[PDB]
Amino acid sequence: LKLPANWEAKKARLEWELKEEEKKKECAARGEDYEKVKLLEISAEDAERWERKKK
Amino acid sequence: LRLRNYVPEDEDLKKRRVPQAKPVAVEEKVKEQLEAAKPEPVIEEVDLANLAPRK
Amino acid sequence: LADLEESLGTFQSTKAVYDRILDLRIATPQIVINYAMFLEEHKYFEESFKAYERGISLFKWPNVSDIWSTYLTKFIARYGGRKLERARDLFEQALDGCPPKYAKTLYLLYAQLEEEWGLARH
Known part of the structure; x- marks a missing residue:
C-alpha cells in the first residue's frame, strides 16, 4: 500500500522485460547473437503494421 | 516422430525436437581481411611481386 | 501442425502446409530454413531455392541478411x-x-x- 498503486503493474512489465533478457541470455548460451535469432523469429506482418503506424 | 518448427509447451515433447542447424559466424572469417585492413605501407620490404605487377 | 505433418504424413501434404503459411505471410525465416532443409531432405533443391527467394521477397532489412547467408x-x-x-x-x-x-x-x-x-x- 505504501508502494505506488501501479508498482505491481510496473513489476509485471519489468518481469516481462527480464523474460526478454532471459531469452537474450538463452541465445547467448546457445552461441548466437539474440538480434540475429530475433530477425530469424520475426514474422514480416508486424513490421508492415509498424510502417503504417509511421505513415 | 520428428518435430522442428514449433516450441512445445510440454518439455517432454520438447525432447522430441530435432536439433536445428546453427549458423557460422561469417564475421570471424571476415577478420582476416579486417587484419589486412591495418593501414600500412604494403611495400613493407622491396618485394618485386608487389613492385612489378603479375600477368 | 507443420511438425505433425512432417512427422506423421506425406511430403506433399506437409509442403502444402508451408504453401498456406507463405500465402498467409505467417512464415518466419527460421521456418523457411526448416522448410529449406526439409526440401533438401526430399532433394528438390530447386524448390528449396524458390522457398528462400519467396521468403526474401516478403521480408525487409535487417532480417533478409541472414536469409541471404543461408541461401548462398x-x-x-x-x-x-x-x-x-x-x-x-x-x-x-x-x-x-x-x-x-x-x-x-x-x-x-x-x-x-x-x-x-x-x-x-x-
Missing part, C-alpha cells in the same frame, strides 16, 4: 560449382538497399567468389 551457403556448395553466373546476379540482388555492416560482409564474399571463379578486375 546452400547454393554455392552443390550448384555454385555447376552454374556460377546466376549467383553473381543473386549477389547483385542481395546488395540492393543493404545496410552497411551486412553489405561489408556481402562485398567481401562476392569479391572472394570473383577471385575464386571470375575476373579479379570485377
Whole structure:
C-alpha cells in the first residue's frame, strides 16, 4: 500500500522485460547473437503494421 | 516422430525436437581481411611481386 | 501442425502446409530454413531455392541478411560449382538497399567468389 498503486503493474512489465533478457541470455548460451535469432523469429506482418503506424 | 518448427509447451515433447542447424559466424572469417585492413605501407620490404605487377 | 505433418504424413501434404503459411505471410525465416532443409531432405533443391527467394521477397532489412547467408551457403556448395553466373546476379540482388555492416560482409564474399571463379578486375 505504501508502494505506488501501479508498482505491481510496473513489476509485471519489468518481469516481462527480464523474460526478454532471459531469452537474450538463452541465445547467448546457445552461441548466437539474440538480434540475429530475433530477425530469424520475426514474422514480416508486424513490421508492415509498424510502417503504417509511421505513415 | 520428428518435430522442428514449433516450441512445445510440454518439455517432454520438447525432447522430441530435432536439433536445428546453427549458423557460422561469417564475421570471424571476415577478420582476416579486417587484419589486412591495418593501414600500412604494403611495400613493407622491396618485394618485386608487389613492385612489378603479375600477368 | 507443420511438425505433425512432417512427422506423421506425406511430403506433399506437409509442403502444402508451408504453401498456406507463405500465402498467409505467417512464415518466419527460421521456418523457411526448416522448410529449406526439409526440401533438401526430399532433394528438390530447386524448390528449396524458390522457398528462400519467396521468403526474401516478403521480408525487409535487417532480417533478409541472414536469409541471404543461408541461401548462398546452400547454393554455392552443390550448384555454385555447376552454374556460377546466376549467383553473381543473386549477389547483385542481395546488395540492393543493404545496410552497411551486412553489405561489408556481402562485398567481401562476392569479391572472394570473383577471385575464386571470375575476373579479379570485377
